[PDB]
Amino acid sequence: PREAAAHWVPFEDKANMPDNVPDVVEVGATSAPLLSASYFIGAKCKPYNDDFMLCREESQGSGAIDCLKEGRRVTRCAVSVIEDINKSCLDEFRLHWQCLEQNNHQLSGCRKAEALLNKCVFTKLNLEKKIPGLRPDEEPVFLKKDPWIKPAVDDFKSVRAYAEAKKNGTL
């Protein structure tokens, strides 16, 4: 909650999780994959994330020590979603975040590999993107046609893959 110093000195601690907290399977995904898979781990693990932030709320100040049980379970189910999207659509997932690693990770620049990934995951893994809080008669922005904000360079591999998905008729 605070921005670093004049002269901040980094340090780590070669230590262990002491006795009673079991070992966990932590997310080893970088900014591009979990920014890509954000809506899908938000769609599957909604009540676990809700439950963790609720438990963090109810133990005011106890907080960190209180819900070790339960931030254990949001990690497990987020790891579950991203293992499933690996084994499901590694190629098109990879296409989307190889797109999204350029363009400042702006989501604006990569509609083309996105819609391909969304078809793939909605088919095999049957999870769907929703922007909640969006009242009807308001189109969600990743569905509209001819947007005002277009990227600088459409990346090449998603141009090719989207054109071949047009030709195959899967899109």
Binding site: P1, M53, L54, R56, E57, S59, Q60, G61, S62, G63
Partner: protein, 59 residues
């Protein structure tokens, strides 16, 4: 007929004396937060600064 007209005045002065003792005790009497400060918004409790807020801050 004059002792009675004195008893009236001495009652009228003892009434004023008790009036003063009351109104000098009614000053030092402690007062609610809803009479002393803002009448609506009767709680002193903040919930101040809610944009980047963290669940688990209430106590």
């Amino acid at each position: 007929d004059i002792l009675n007209e004195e008893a009236k005045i001495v009652q009228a002065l003892n009434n004023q004396r008790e009036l003063t003792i009351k109104m000098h005790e009614l000053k030092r009497e402690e007062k609610d937060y809803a009479h002393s400060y803002s009448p609506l918004f009767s709680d002193p409790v903040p919930q101040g600064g809610s944009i980047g807020k963290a669940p688990g801050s209430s106590r």
